[PDB]
Every structure is written in structure tokens, then in C-alpha cells.
Amino acid sequence: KACPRPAPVPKLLIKGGMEVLDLVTGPDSVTEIEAFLNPRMGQPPTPESLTEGGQYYGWSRGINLATSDTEDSPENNTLPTWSMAKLQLPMLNEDLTCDTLQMWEAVSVKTEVVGSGSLLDVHGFNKPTDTVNTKGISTPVEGSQYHVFAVGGEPLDLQGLVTDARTKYKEEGVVTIKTITKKDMVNKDQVLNPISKAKLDKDGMYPVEIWHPDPAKNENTRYFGNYTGGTTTPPVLQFTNTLTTVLLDENGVGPLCKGEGLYLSCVDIMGWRVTRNYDVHHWRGLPRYFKITLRKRWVKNPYPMASLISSLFNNMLPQVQGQPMEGENTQVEEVRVYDG
Amino acid sequence: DLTCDTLQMWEAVSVKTEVVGSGSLLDVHGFNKPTDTVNTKGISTPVEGSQYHVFAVGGEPLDLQGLVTDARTKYKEEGVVTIKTITKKDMVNKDQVLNPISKAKLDKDGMYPVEIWHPDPAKNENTRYFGNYTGGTTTPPVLQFTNTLTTVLLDENGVGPLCKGEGLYLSCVDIMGWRVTRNYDVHHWRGLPRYFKITLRKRWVKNPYPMASLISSLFNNMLPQVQGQPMEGENTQVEEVRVYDGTEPVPGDPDMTRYVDRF
Amino acid sequence: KACPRPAPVPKLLIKGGMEVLDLVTGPDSVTEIEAFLNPRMGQPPTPESLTEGGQYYGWSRGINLATSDTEDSPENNTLPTWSMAKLQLPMLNEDLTCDTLQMWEAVSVKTEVVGSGSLLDVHGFNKPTDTVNTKGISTPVEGSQYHVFAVGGEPLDLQGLVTDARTKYKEEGVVTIKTITKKDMVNKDQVLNPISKAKLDKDGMYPVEIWHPDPAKNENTRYFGNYTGGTTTPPVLQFTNTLTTVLLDENGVGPLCKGEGLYLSCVDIMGWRVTRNYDVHHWRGLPRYFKITLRKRWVKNPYPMASLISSLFNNMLPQVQGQPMEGENTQVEEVRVYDGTEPVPGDPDMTRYVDRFGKTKTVFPGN
């Protein structure tokens, strides 16, 4: 009316947790999910006490070197590994009159590594700057850093590529190139072996030092990353809650969620700290916060209904043995076909 | 279509490249020189040093140029291609700087060292090459994953590498630095593999197969081959050549000096 | 008949060496010239032998310091210098009817320091990394780096500025601030003297520690450079045949080659190499490849042809000296210029003048 009216903004419909997604929202609504991933790298979170586990939670346990060129065992609780998570979104509408579907579509993302100011803790029992007298400042976190994240509609497809391939990783509790292809490592696993591939499926189990995000032929995942080697490289980080990332493809399609799950993955190694002893080198990693903005897109169902009905029946039913009713020793005797 | 001048052939429109394997440099166990050497404890130092990333997408093999730090180095003449292997003589002092004679192509693979052969900026080129170098003895490596944005191989006229013959040539070198062993400090380089994804489309061009060449080799291969006195090269016995096309008014000095410094 | 038509791209007339330019083409012809400049820093290229010259070609010879604060003499094969070259282009058309004439106009340039990967030569005889045993890696080329290039229609106007004005450079084979201004240097030549200006006539003669590209009032060249000091600073480079520079101006003109030559200049210092015996940091440089794209532009001729022809023909007359009729001791006591006709004035001893626009009766002197 004559009364002043404020500029329109997108009308918030409902706020809360994941249960919010059960609301039938409509065909043109946008969903924003905030989540985070903790740096599962080395020490597992389970010994909750700060004295029995020393609470190196968020740090690796301790990097012990090798004793010879051929003998090298990385000690699983040392290796920093990939963090991943999957959000289970609801099922959507469809239209079998036109064989057209609806599925989620991650449109954009705001990421941020939380907790850099924490690296300003310069007291503590680390190696001192003035070591001759053990005075000054506890040398803060420095070194090789590695920041990767990935937002997709299906688990991250990654590749095996290692440094020295004689390395004897523990054969249980960690996923190594030997765990996937049941034979040992070869030399071609040192440069690139199109056989040593995997999916980042579990969590906290695929060491970053072995499995790298793989550029497959046709991909449904947007992954960004950067590396910075060295031994004393000063860590650098940036925050802001303003700038986003667009996940749209060249056709403006973005990651459509296979099944209904949206997959997030990340690793953020910020360096390693040195103890006032034999210079043990516990890694450090910081949690990464994701904010994904998705919407509902109409897609064409590319498969015949009868085919996926048969597939559903084949997957639901057991796969059995029984007496041979086909082949060389058929027990089926005769077959007759009438019409009228 | 070898009856009309038109003919179609491939054309690289864009490329998506990525050096895959960066995180593997975080393997800080193992038998390299340790961080703290007085007690031989700490961290087996990671890969550092001079790094050199070049790649090139083209329709014909990379044209390379020779330039060496030291022209007195004695590279083995068997199993590696060197300025000697191509110029057939010893190296000249002009090979510590640009020498327009030490030119080659990338015929072989794993044969042309990078301390000698660099991507050559030939005047007419069918190849797009990108590169960056970072020296130092302890420089930390830096890399970047992403599957997001591409490189456009189009030229200023919007053509991009036309695959002549019918092949597409990819070339690359990715040196990340050297690891120093726990011994006599023997460094040795590390290199990571590079993944290319090229987007090709078909383009109509004019015919590069001149039938005149064949219907002239049919004459040439009926006559013997005799060199005679040199009418081509550096001892040319061809004094002067001039081409008349039309009719112009009778000039003054017909062989007028066109350059100002000649006066 | 209906075979499909390919796309239109510029048609190449003839390619080859510089003589290709002798073919007269027209007003829309575009020319692209490739060239390279070698690093002339210290050891000259002349002793072709690899034992008598040691072949420090492309390298400086060797750096010896100053024995005391007062005396500091740097040798001529120690100082890295500017590289330059001139490409003499043909003559173009004129138009005496409308007093215009066309000139070569350098539109754009693709440049690149070629030879970066050669610094991956870490074998050889330099200071090793593990000095306590003389083992490891022959330390690579590092240190103060300095890249400059410049494309213009006239030699690079440059300017002198030195860290030490008490340095004794040699009087032969190198152009110093003492060569241009015949007097020895002063302390102004340590900060900025508008008096110590030069050009880039010579090549491999102007040391880079003295002569810097000068931001004159006017300029017909475009020069781009970057410096990076230090003692250990790692060299960094980039190559690609896809990046171009646009030499155009704010008005969209670019370097007009006045006098049809086109001048290229450059310096590319990558850092020093340290020998093993003593502490020496040889200066190292790489060649720079230029590719200039030029077109033909009509420009109004600035100077009246009548003035030039009259000055040329008056210069052949027999000059004679008699008595001073100009200057401070003039012997001419009058000049009166009557133009029209006016009624008889009053004061017949009057004076009339023209001030900066117009003619006025000189102020009535009864002040």
C-alpha cells in the first residue's frame, strides 16, 4: 500500500536439522546444509581421556623413520587419512508419463578451514627456538601442508600413487594398494598404474600419502586441492564468510546426487610439530566446514522401466545353486510350445 | 575430398591437464637424510629443489632448441640425443646462449634431456606449450589439484592445433625436486605423471596434399639424381632472380634502394 | 560446386628473411618479425675456443671485491650490460598533396626468455651443497635477478644512478656517467641527476649497474621490467607461446618507428654461479626472443616541407662573416613594419607593439 515495503528476499520456509528435509517443500526451493569434517588423521577419537590417549586427537601419533632402505613400516596411527561423510537426502517426485525424474543438484558451496588462530599457541613443550639453552618460543606448526576438499553426488574416485613401493603398510585397519588389487605393489604404482584405483568409501582409512583424487573419464564430483611441500614452510590460511564456490559444470548441471546421498570429502594437513626430545613429528590437521546449496532438477530417466524392474528383482532375490538345469548336464528333458 | 580444395581434419579446441600424485610427497618415513642430522633423528626430509613443469599439445611434434649451461660437458653419445647427435660436430660456445643451428624435434621419447632441449619459439607453430620453472636448492614444491577449469588452445584466429598427418602430440616434463639419501648426499629427481584431456572437433580446411607433388615425382623418379654445381645453399651460383608480373610506367632507378641507411 | 567453404584467416604473402620486406604489399599488410637477443654480460663472444676463453660466454667473467673503501675498480668483463638491436625496415609511401605519410607502427610483441630449463644442470664443478665434505649437488644458479625488455621506434632513453659514486670504472670499452658528462661523478649521480642521461646507441657497452630505463617526459618505446634482489633467491620463469603484450598507447598508437628502424633492448640476469676454489659469483644471462607485429599507419607530417627544403638549399650558399647584426652587440637600431594605412597619428615618435596576442599602442609614456 502507501506503507513502505522492504526489498524481497528468498522466503525462509523451515529451519532446523536434517529432519527439516521431510517437509514437502515444492519444485523451486533451495536447501542449504551446514556440516563439518574433523581431521581424522592418525589418532582415532575413541580414547576420550586426556591421559591414556595423551589426546593427540587431531594430531598423528609420531613419525618414526625407517631402519634400512628395504625395511619401512608406516604404523597406521601415524598416517593421515581422508575424511569423508555422506548426507542422506529424501526421495523426490517423478513423472512416468514422460519418464522424467527429480534429483538433488549441489549448486554451490562455502568452505572454510576452522581454527587457524589455534596455531598461535606458542607456549607448550615443543622444540624451542633457542635450543642451546632451551629458551624462547616453542616452534609452532610448520611444514608440508595439503588442503583438498571435494563435493560430489557419489563417492570420490581416487587413484593409488606412492613414493618408494617397498613400503610395507600394515595389512589390516588401513586401505593400501595391496588391499584393493590383492597382489603386492609394483614399480608402476610409483608413477601411475591405471589398475590401482579405488573409491573413497569408508572414512579415515585411505591414507592421503597413497590415494589421490583421480581424474576419471566422466565424473560427478568437484574436487579442489593444493599442496605446499618443504620442511619449515610457514602455514598460510584464509577465512571469510562471503565468497562461495560454484559447482556448476560447463553445461550448468553440477553434481547430481546418485542414490540420494551427497558426499563430502576433505583433508587439511597444516604441518607437523616437534617435541623437546628425539624430534618426533606429530602431524596437525584442522576441521573443514562445508555449506552446500542444492536444488531440485528435472532429469530424464535413461533406462527402460522393465530393465530396472528385472534388476530390482535380481538384487532382492538370493543368488542360488540348485541342480544343473542348463548347460551340458541339463536335467530339463523336453520343452514344448503351443499356440492353439 | 581430393577433388575440391576443401578437406576436413581434427582440431584441438581445449585441454584439461593435471599433475597427479602431489600428496605422495608427504611420505616422510623412509631412508632419506633426516631433518635433525646431529643425532640422525626427526623426519626423512621431503622432496625439494629446482622444479620444472612444462606441457605441450600440438598437431606436430614439439620443436626444440639447444642451450646448455656448460658447452664442455661430455654427454654419452649412445642412448641420448644431444646437440652433437644432430649437428654432428662438437658443441660451440654459441650453445651456452641461443644458437639458431641447434634445433630439433621431439621424435623420440625419454631421449631428449631437459638440461639441453627447450621448447623452441619457431615463427610458424602448430603447438601450444605452457611451462614454469622454479630454481633453488631447498625450494618447497607447490601444486594445485582441480577438475574445474580448462585451457583454451584456440589461436588468435580461433583455430587451435590442427592435427596434421592425423596424430595428436602430447609432451610434458614434471620435475618436483630431488631427494637426498642418508649417505654421500646423492640427490635424484622425482617426477609426477601428468594427465591430459583434450577436446577435439572437426574443421574444414584447404587441401594440404598437393597432387602436383605426386604428378611431379612421377617425372623426377624417371630421371637420375645428379648434384652438379651448387645452385642452392651457401655457395649458390645463382646471381640474381627477379619476377615480372604486370605492366608499370617506366621507373627511374628500377633497383631503387629501399632502406634509408644505404644512403 | 558446393564443396563446403573453410573459415577465413589472414592470407600469408611471403615469408623468409628480412629481404621478404622488399615486396611492396599495400596499406593493410601486417608484418611479424621474429628475432632474439643474446645475453651480453661480461665475457665477449669473440674467443670462440673453449679453452682460451674458458667459455664463460653467456656468463660474467668473475667478481673480485674492493680491497678498500676508497679504491674500487670493476673490470669490464665483470659488469653485465644492456643488449640492443635495430631492425631496419623499408621505406613507405608519402603524400605531398595532403602532407601525410605512413610509418611502421609496432602493434604488439610476444617475448620470452628462452633457456630456463638449462639451469637444471646440477652436475658440474661448482660449490657443492654439503661443503664440509665437498659432496652432494653442485649448487645451481641463484641470486639477484633482473629482467628488462623494451620495444620502441628510437633508442632507449636511459638515466644514470649508481650505488657508489666513488667507483673507478675503466675509461675504455664501457659507457659510464663520466663518459656522458665528462666530469667525474658527484653525489647527485648517486640519487637522481637530470644531467646524466644517455641513449642506447651501443650494444653490450652500458652496464646495468649504472644505466636504467628513464621515464622521460615523452617516450616512443614501451619498456617492462622486474628486479628481485637477495643472495639466495631462487630464479623463477614462465614460458608460453600464447601470451602477448599490446604495445598500443592510451590513444591506441604504439611505437612509431621514426627513421624506419625498430629498436629492441633487453637484459636478463638470472643470478650468479659460485665456483669452488674461491668465492666467485659469475653473472649469468639467458637469451630473449622477441616477436613484433607491426602495421602501416598514416600520420600527419609534423614539419613543413618548405622549411626543410629552404634550409637545405640555404646551407649550400657561401656563409660569410662581416659585422654583428644580431645578438648582444647588434648593430641594427630599427625595425618598422607598416602594413595598412591609417590617419595621421599624434606623437610621431610613437611606438607600437604586439603582445602575445595582439597589437597595442605602447602605453602613453606619461606614466
Which residue in C148, C112, C117 sits closest to C290, CA to CA?
Answer: C112
- Angstrom distance (rounded) from CA A29 to CA B33: 58
Q: Compare all CA atoms of chain C with the CA of B132 and give the residue at the minimum distance.
A: C238
User: Which residues in B lie closer than 8 A to residue A278 (C-beta atoms)?
Assistant: 39, 41-42
CA-wise closest residue to B174 among C139, C142, A210, C120: C120
With CA atoms as reference, the chain C residue closest to B66 would be C115
Instruction: Quote the DSSP letter at residue A80.
Output: B
The answer to whether the Cβ–Cβ distance between B24 and A192 falls below 8 Å is no
Nearest CA in chain C to B131: C239
Closest chain B residue to the Cα of C120, Cα to Cα: B115
3-state class (DSSP) for residue C21: helix
Report resolution in angstroms: 3.3
Most A CBs within 10 Å: which of B41, B147, B179, B180, as the mutation test of the A interface? B147
Chain C CB contacts of B258 under 8 Å are 22, 90-91
- Cα–Cα distance for residue pair C367/A124, rounded to 1 Å: 93
For residues A231 and A89, what is the distance between their CA atoms, to the nearest angstrom?
A: 43
Best of B69, B82, B171 to substitute, by most chain C Cβ atoms within 10 angstroms, is B69
CB atoms < 10 A from the CB of A179, how many? 15
Chains C, A in contact, 3 or more Cβ pairs below 8 Å:
no
Helices first, then strands: H and E counts in chain B:
2, 13
Chain centroid, CA C88 distance in Å:
15
CB of C141 closer than 8 Å to CB of C270: yes
Residue A106 inside a domain? The answer is yes
> Which residues contact residue B78 at a Cβ distance below 8 angstroms, ignoring those fewer than 6 apart?
none
Point out the residue among B30, B147, B197 whose CB comes nearest to the CB of A222: B147
Give me the CATH number covering residue A32: 2.60.175.10
| Sign of the alpha-carbon dihedral angle for C321, C327, C333, C335 | positive
* Least Cα separation, residue A225 to chain B (angstroms): 5
User: Hey, are the CB atoms on A281 and B35 less than 8 Å from each other?
Assistant: yes
| Cα Rg, chain B, nearest whole Å | 26
Put simply, the answer to whether B42 touches A64 (Cβ < 8 Å) is: no
Grid cell in block for residue C354? 604586439
Gap from C53 CA to chain B (nearest CA, Å): 9
Q: What share of chain C is helix, strand, coil (3-state, %, to 5)?
A: 5, 30, 60
Task: Tell me which amino acid residue C47 is.
Answer: P
C-beta pairs of C240-245 under 8 Å, 24+ apart in sequence: C240/B128, C240/B129, C240/B130, C240/B131, C240/C112, C241/B119, C241/B121, C241/B125, C241/B127, C241/B128, C241/B129, C241/C110, C241/C112, C242/B128, C242/B130, C243/C110, C244/B156, C244/C108, C244/C109, C244/C110, C245/C108, C245/C109, C245/C110, C245/C111
- Contact at CB, C242 and B130, closer than 8 angstroms: yes
From the list B92, B121, B135, the residue facing C289 with the nearest CB is: B121
Burial B168-178 (b: 16+ CB within 10 A, else e): bbebbbbbbbb
Neighbours of chain C (3+ CB pairs under 8 A): B
| Pairwise CB contact (< 8 Å): B44 & A65 | yes
Q: Is residue B261 part of a domain?
A: no
Contact yes or no for B23 and A281 at CB 8 A: no
- Report CB contact under 8 Å: A64, B148: no
Query: C70 is in which domain, residue-wise?
Result: 18-316
Judged by CB atoms closer than 8 Å, whether chains meet at B131 and C289 is answered as no
In 3D, which of B60, B64, B129, B77 has the Cα closest to residue B103?
B64
DSSP state, C41?
A: B
Pair C256, C33: CB distance under 8 Å: no
N residues, chain C: 367
Contacts of A161 in chain B (CB under 8 A): 20-21, 24, 192-193
Among B13, B145, B188, pick the best mutation site for testing chain A contact (most A Cβ within 10 A): B145
- Name the residue facing C135 among B54, B100, B184 (closest C-beta): B184
State the count of interchain CB pairs (< 8 A) between A and B: 150
- Cell numbers for C130: 654439503
Q: How far, in Å, CA of C362 to CA of C207, rounded?
A: 59
Interface B-C, measured as beta-carbon pairs within 8 A, has a size of 192
**Residue A212: closest CA among A223, A203, A204, A221:** A223
> Which is it for the CA torsion C173, C175, C176, C177, positive or negative?
positive
Residues in chain B: 263
Q: In A142-156, which positions are buried (b, 16+ CB within 10 angstroms) versus exposed (e)?
A: bbbbbbbbbbbbbbb
The answer to whether the CB atoms of C15 and B119 lie below 8 A apart is no
* Chain B residues close to A139, C-beta within 8 Å: none
Report the DSSP beta bridge partners of residue C238: B132
The span from the CA of A304 to the CA of A314, in Å, is: 16
- β A100-113/A245-246 pair status: antiparallel
Q: Which residues contact A97 (CB under 8 A, 6 or more apart)?
A: none
Q: Which residues of B touch A69 (CB under 8 A)?
A: 30-31
Query: How distant is the Cα of A187 from the closest Cα of chain B, in angstroms?
Result: 13
Q: Assess if residue B120 is contained within a domain.
A: yes
Q: From which experimental method does this structure derive?
A: cryo-EM
List the beta bridge partners of residue C284.
C59, C271
Phi and psi at residue A78, to the nearest 5°: -90, -35
Contact yes or no for A209 and B144 at CB 8 A = no
Q: Is residue A26 part of a domain?
A: yes
Q: Decide if C10 is inside a domain.
A: no
Q: Which residues of C touch B4 (CB under 8 A)?
A: 3
HSE-CB at A282 with a 13 A cutoff on CA atoms is 21
CA distance B214 to chain C (A): 23
Q: Report the C-alpha gap between B63 and B105 in whole angstroms.
A: 4
* C-alpha distance across the termini of chain A, in Å: 79
CA distance C293 to chain B (A): 12
Q: Please name the chains neighbouring A, where neighbouring means 3+ C-beta pairs under 8 angstroms.
A: B
Residue C324 lies in a domain: no
Is A331 within the bounds of a domain?
no
Flag whether A256 is in a domain: yes
A 10 A CB-CB count for C186 gives 13
Which of C4, C118, C237 is closest, CB to CB, to B132? C237
CA distance C159 to chain B (A): 27
Distance from CA of B118 to the nearest CA of A (A): 24
d(CA C20, CA B11): 30
Total domains in the fold of chain A = 1
- Which residues lie closer than 8 Å to B125 by C-beta, 6 or more apart? B58, B63, C241
Backbone dihedral angles phi then psi of residue A309, each to the nearest 5 degrees: -65, -45
| Cβ-contact A275, B38 below 8 angstroms | no
The residue among C5, C38, C145, C242 with the most chain B CBs within 10 A of its CB, best to mutate, is C242
Q: C238 and B131 in contact (C-beta within 8 Å)?
A: yes
